[PDB]
């Protein structure tokens, strides 16, 4: 199936509580493989999956050099953005950046991303054509013009279409045993009633990987959304995910309802019915 590599960077200013804190994390699909924490012991990019340990010292040195450089750029940006927005030196602010690439089943380039946020909202983003920018507001137009003049998009495009895809492929190969695995959800349905009039049916999906999954209820084979609840997919902590969907039904009508499970790990759509 399809795959992605993404990096997520967060920089936070804390006036009077030191200089800014910077965190970087890298993922292939739903598996984290590296981290950097500017306040942590090592002061290096660190491994967070076993297959990344195949990389040698030149890699670790390089990734460390780059991420420290990323962090120093954000330290400058935090100051710049306070000026752009006419803000005091007294409040705490947040810069976030995300970039990465998607490949299809054939491991060929599908699309690339590079987006930037300030204080929990969009600031500037590279458009899907990887040749143009979208500025979120008037302040960000200053940045857009700068980056256009400096041919930033061209530099980013070459990484996104080349290096990003090549390294995602390398990782997929080096970590084949775990990264290319599909763990079908273990599924079951429970029944709960607190009155004689209605019951809750809860359809469970456990121990699955990757995180992408669809749970849907039907009644007499027609899509059913009213009187339903669907929790956010959540990490088990062991590299797998969990999700449930519930529906409230009139007593004696449990058999009308079916839970439908779609996941990459299943050869077909699964259907569950009470009991």
């Amino acid at each position: 199936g399809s795959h992605s590599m993404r990096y997520f960077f967060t920089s936070v200013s804390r006036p009077g509580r030191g200089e800014p804190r910077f965190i970087a994390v890298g993922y292939v699909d739903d598996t984290q493989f590296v981290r950097f924490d500017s306040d942590a012991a090592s002061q290096r990019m660190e491994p967070r999956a076993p297959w990344i340990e195949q990389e040698g010292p030149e890699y670790w040195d390089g990734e460390t050099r780059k991420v420290k450089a990323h962090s120093q750029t954000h330290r400058v940006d935090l100051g710049t953005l306070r000026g752009y927005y006419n803000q005091s030196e007294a409040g705490s602010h947040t810069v976030q950046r995300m970039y990465g690439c998607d490949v299809g089943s054939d491991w060929r380039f599908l699309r690339g991303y590079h987006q930037y946020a300030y204080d929990g909202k969009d600031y500037i983003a590279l458009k899907e054509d990887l040749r143009s920018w979208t500025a979120a507001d008037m302040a960000a137009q200053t940045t857009k013009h700068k980056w256009e003049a400096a041919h930033v998009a061209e530099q980013l495009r070459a990484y996104l279409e080349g290096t990003c895809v090549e390294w995602l492929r390398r990782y997929l190969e080096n970590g084949k045993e775990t990264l290319q695995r599909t763990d079908a959800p273990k599924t079951h349905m429970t029944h709960h009633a607190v009155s004689d009039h209605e019951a809750t049916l809860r359809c469970w999906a456990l121990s699955f990987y990757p995180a992408e999954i669809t749970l849907t209820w039907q009644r007499d084979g027609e899509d059913q959304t009213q009187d339903t609840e669907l929790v956010e997919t959540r990490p088990a902590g062991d590299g797998t995910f969990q999700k449930w969907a519930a529906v409230v039904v009139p007593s004696g009508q449990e058999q009308r309802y079916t839970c439908h499970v779609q996941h990459e790990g299943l050869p077909k759509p699964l259907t569950l019915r009470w009991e």
């Binding site: 990096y7 890298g26 990019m45 890699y59 390089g62 990734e63 780059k66 991420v67 450089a69 990323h70 750029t73 400058v76 940006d77 710049t80 953005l81 752009y84 970039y99 930037y116 600031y123 500037i124 940045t143 700068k146 980056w147 400096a150 930033v152 530099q155 980013l156 990484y159 290096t163 990003c164 390294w167």
Partner: peptide, 10 residues
């Protein structure tokens, strides 16, 4: 693997 930059300032 991580973008080799340069990281242009905003």
């Amino acid at each position: 693997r991580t973008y080799s930059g340069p990281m242009n300032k905003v």
